PDB file of C-alpha atoms and ligand atoms in Angstrom:
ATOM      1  CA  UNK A   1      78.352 105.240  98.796  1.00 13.87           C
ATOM      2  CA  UNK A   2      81.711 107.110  98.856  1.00 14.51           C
ATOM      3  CA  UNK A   3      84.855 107.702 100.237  1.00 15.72           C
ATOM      4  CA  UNK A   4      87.610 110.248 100.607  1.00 14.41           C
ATOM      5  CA  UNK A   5      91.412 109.144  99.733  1.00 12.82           C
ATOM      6  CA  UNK A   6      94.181 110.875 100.959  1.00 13.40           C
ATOM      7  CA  UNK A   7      97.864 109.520 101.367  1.00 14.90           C
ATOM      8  CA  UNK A   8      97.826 106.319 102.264  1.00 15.57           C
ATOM      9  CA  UNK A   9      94.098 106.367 103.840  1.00 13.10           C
ATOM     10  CA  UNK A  10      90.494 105.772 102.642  1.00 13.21           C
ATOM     11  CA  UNK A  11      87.721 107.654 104.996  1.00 12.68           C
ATOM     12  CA  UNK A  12      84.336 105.797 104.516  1.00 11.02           C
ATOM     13  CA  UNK A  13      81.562 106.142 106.661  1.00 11.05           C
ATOM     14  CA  UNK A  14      81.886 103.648 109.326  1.00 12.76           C
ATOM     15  CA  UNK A  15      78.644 101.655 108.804  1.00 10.04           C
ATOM     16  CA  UNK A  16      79.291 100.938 104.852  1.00  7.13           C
ATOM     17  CA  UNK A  17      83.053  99.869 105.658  1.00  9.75           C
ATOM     18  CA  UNK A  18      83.780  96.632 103.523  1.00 10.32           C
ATOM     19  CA  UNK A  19      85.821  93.286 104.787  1.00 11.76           C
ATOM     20  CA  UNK A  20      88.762  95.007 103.589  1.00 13.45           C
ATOM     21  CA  UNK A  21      88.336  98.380 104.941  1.00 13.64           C
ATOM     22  CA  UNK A  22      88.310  96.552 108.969  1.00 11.20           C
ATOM     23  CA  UNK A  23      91.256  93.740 107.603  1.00 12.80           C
ATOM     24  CA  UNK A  24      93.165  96.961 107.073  1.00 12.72           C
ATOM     25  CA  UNK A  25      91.949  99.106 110.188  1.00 12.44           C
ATOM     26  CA  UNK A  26      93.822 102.395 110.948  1.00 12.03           C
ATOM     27  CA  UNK A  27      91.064 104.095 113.571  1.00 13.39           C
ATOM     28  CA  UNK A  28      87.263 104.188 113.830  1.00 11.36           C
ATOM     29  CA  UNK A  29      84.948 106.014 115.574  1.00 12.49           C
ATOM     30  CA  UNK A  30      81.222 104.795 115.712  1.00  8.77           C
ATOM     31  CA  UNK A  31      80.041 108.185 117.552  1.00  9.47           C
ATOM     32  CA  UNK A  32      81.435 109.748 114.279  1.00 10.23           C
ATOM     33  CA  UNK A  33      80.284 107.170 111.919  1.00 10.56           C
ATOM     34  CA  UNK A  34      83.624 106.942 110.435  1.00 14.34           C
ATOM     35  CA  UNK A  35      86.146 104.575 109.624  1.00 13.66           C
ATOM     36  CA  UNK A  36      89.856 105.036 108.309  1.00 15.63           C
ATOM     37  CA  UNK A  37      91.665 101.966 106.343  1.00 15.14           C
ATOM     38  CA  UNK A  38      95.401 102.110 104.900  1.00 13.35           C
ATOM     39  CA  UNK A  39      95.865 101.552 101.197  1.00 14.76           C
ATOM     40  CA  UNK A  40      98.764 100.912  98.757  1.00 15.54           C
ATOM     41  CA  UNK A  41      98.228 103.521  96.542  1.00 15.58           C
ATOM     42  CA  UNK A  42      98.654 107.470  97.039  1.00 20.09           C
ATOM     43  CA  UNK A  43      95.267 109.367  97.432  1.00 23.12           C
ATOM     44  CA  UNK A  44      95.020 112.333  95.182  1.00 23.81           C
ATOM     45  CA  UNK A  45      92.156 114.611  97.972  1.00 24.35           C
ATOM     46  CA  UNK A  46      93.243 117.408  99.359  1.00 26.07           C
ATOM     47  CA  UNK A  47      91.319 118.188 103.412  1.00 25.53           C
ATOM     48  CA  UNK A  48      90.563 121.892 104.039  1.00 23.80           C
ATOM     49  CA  UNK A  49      91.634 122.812 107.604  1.00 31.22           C
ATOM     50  CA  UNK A  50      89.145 125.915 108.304  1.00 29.85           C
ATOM     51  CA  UNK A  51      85.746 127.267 109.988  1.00 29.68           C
ATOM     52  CA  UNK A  52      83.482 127.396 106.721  1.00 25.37           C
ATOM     53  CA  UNK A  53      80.443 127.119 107.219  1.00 24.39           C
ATOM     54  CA  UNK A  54      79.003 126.814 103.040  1.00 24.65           C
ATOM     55  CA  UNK A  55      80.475 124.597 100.616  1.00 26.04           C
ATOM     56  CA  UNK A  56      79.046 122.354  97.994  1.00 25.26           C
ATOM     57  CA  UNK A  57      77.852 118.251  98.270  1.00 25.49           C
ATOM     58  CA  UNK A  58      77.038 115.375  95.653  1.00 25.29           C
ATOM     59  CA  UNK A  59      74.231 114.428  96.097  1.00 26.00           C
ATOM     60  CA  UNK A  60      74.095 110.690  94.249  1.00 24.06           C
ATOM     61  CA  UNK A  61      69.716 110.386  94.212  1.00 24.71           C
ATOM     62  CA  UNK A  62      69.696 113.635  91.787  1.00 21.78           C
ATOM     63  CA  UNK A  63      73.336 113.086  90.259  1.00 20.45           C
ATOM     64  CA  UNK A  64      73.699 116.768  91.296  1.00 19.70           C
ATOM     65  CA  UNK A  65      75.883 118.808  93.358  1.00 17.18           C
ATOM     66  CA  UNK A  66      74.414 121.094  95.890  1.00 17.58           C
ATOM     67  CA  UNK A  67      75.938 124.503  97.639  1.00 15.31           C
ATOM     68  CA  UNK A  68      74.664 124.502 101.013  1.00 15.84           C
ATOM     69  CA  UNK A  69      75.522 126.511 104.505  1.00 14.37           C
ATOM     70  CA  UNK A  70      75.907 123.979 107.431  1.00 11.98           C
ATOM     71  CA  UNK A  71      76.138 124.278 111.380  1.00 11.57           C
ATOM     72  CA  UNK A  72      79.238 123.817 113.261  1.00 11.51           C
ATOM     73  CA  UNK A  73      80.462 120.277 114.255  1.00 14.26           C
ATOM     74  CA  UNK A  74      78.598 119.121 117.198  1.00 14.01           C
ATOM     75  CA  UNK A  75      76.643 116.531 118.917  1.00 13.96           C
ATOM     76  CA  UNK A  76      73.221 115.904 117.332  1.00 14.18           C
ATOM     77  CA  UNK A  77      70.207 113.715 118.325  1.00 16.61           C
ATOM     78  CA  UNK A  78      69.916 110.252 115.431  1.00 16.58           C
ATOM     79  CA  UNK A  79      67.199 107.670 115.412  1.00 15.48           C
ATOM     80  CA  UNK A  80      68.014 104.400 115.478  1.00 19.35           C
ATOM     81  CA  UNK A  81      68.707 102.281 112.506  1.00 20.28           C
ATOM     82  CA  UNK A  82      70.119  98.847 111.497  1.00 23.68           C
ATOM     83  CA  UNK A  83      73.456  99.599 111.789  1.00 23.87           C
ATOM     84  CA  UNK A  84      73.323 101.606 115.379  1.00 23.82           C
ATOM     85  CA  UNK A  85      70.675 102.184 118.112  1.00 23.23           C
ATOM     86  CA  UNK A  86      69.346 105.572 119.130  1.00 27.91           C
ATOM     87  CA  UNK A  87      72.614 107.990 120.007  1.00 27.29           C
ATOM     88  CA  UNK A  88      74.134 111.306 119.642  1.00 27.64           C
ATOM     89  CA  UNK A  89      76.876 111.035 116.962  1.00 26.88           C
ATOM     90  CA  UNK A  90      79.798 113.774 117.461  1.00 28.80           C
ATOM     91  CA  UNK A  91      81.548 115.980 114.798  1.00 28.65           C
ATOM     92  CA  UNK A  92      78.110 116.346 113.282  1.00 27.71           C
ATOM     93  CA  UNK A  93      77.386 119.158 110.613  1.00 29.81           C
ATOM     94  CA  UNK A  94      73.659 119.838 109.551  1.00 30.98           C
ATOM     95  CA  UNK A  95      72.625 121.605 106.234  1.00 31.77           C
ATOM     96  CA  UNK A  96      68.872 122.270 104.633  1.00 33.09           C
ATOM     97  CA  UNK A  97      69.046 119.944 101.741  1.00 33.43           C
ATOM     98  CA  UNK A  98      67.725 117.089  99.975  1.00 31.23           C
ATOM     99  CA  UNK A  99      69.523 113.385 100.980  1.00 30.80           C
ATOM    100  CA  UNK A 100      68.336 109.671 101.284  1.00 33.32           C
ATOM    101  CA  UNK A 101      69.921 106.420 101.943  1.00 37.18           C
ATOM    102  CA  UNK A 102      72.255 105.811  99.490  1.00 36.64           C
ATOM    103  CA  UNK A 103      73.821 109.648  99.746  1.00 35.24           C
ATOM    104  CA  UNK A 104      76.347 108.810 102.278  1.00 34.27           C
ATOM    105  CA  UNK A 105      79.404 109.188 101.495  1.00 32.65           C
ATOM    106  CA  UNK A 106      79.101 111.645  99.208  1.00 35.96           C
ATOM    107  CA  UNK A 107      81.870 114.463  99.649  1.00 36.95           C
ATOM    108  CA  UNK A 108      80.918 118.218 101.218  1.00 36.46           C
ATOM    109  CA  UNK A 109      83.674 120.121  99.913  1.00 36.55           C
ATOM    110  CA  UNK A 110      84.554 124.574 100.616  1.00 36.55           C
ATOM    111  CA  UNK A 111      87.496 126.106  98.786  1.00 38.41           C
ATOM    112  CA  UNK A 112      89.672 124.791 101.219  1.00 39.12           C
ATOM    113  CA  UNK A 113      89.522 121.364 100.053  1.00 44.93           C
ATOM    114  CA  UNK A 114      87.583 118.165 101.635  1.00 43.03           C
ATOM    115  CA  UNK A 115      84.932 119.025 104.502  1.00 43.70           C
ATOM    116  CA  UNK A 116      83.587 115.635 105.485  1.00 44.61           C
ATOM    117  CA  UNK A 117      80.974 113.194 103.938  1.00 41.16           C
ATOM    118  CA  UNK A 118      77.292 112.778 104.153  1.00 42.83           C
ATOM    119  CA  UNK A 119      76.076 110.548 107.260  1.00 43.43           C
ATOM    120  CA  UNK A 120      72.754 111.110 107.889  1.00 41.38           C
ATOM    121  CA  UNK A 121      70.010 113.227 106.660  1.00 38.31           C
ATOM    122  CA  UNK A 122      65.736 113.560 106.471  1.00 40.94           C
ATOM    123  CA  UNK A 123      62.695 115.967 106.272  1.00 42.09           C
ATOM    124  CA  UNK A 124      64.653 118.208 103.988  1.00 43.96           C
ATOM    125  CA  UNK A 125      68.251 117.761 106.223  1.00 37.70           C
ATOM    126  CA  UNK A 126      71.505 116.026 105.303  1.00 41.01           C
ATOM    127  CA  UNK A 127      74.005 115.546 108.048  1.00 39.95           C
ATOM    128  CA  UNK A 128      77.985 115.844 107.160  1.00 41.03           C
ATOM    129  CA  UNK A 129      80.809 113.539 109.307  1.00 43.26           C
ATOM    130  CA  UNK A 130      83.324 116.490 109.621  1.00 39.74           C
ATOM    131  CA  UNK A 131      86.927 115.563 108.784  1.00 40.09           C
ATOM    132  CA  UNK A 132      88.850 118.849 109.453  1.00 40.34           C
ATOM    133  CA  UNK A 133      90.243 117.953 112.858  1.00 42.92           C
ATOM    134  CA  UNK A 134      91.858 114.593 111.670  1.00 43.95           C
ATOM    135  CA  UNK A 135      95.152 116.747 111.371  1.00 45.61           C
ATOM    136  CA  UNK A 136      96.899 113.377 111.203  1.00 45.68           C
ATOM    137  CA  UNK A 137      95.494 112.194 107.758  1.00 45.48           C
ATOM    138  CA  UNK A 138      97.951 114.929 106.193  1.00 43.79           C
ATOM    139  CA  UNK A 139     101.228 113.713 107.713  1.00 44.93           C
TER     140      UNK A 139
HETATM  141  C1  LIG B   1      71.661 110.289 104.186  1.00 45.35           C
HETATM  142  O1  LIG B   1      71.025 109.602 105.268  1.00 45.35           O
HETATM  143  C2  LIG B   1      69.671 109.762 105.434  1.00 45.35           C
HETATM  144  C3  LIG B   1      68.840 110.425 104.541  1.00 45.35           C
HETATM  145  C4  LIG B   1      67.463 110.411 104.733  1.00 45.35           C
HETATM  146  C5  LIG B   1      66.916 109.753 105.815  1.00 45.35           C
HETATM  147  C6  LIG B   1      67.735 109.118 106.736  1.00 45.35           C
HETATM  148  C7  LIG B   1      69.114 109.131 106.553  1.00 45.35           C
HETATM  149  N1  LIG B   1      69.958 108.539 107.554  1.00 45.35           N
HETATM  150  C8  LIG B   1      70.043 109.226 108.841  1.00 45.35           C
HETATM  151  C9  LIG B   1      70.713 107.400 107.353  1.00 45.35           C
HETATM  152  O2  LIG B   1      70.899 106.961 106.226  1.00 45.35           O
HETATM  153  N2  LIG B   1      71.180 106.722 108.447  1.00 45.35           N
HETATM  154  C10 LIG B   1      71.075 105.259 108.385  1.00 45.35           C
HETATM  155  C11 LIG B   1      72.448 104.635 108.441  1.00 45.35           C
HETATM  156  C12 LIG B   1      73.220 105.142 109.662  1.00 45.35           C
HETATM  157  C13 LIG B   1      73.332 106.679 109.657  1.00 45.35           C
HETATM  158  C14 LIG B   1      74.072 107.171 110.889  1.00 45.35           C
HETATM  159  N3  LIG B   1      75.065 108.022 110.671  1.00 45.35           N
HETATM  160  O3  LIG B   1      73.766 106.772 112.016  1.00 45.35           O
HETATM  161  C15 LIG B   1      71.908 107.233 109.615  1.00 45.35           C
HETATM  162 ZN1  LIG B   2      87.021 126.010 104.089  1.00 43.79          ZN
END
């Protein structure tokens, strides 16, 4: 589980959204695995708006946080689970690192500020939903 709030928006990966989260629907994406719901209060996250590629993750199944390098966002192969059939999911940033169900969400951050959130992972990967582009969570 987690989320990123910024402004007026909560970014939560799109196949752990609650009732809520689609009763207050700004934009999803299920090629990203994202989802983007309005709140009431003010969000106190900050989104970098760069090329890193290293940063640091929580990783929630060893209450640790990790610095990693990842790849660029792009298209990338998943298998099919219970909450989407086989697909290539977009925006997708892969890193050499531990990660299991129950990691995503978990925020990838650089010095920049907030990358994007854990979405997938396996064999000793974790895949990151990048959040970078979404210029329009800032204004
Ligand atoms: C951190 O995730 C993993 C870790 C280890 C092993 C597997 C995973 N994967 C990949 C997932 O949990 N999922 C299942 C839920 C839907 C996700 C998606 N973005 O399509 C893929
Ligand atoms: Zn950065």
């Amino acid at each position: 589980s987690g989320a990123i709030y910024v402004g007026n928006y909560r970014v939560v990966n799109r196949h752990l959204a609650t009732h809520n989260d689609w009763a207050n629907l700004v934009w999803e994406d299920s090629s990203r695995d994202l989802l983007v719901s309005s709140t009431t209060a003010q969000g106190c996250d900050t989104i970098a708006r760069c090329d890193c590629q290293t940063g640091v993750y929580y990783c929630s199944s060893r209450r640790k946080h990790y610095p990693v390098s990842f790849s660029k966002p792009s298209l990338i192969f998943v298998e099919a689970s219970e909450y989407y059939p086989a697909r290539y999911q977009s925006h997708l940033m892969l890193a050499v690192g531990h990660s299991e169900p129950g990691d995503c969400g978990g925020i990838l951050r650089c010095q920049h500020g907030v990358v994007g959130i854990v979405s997938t992972g396996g064999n000793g990967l974790v895949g990151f939903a990048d959040v970078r582009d979404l210029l329009w969570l800032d204004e």
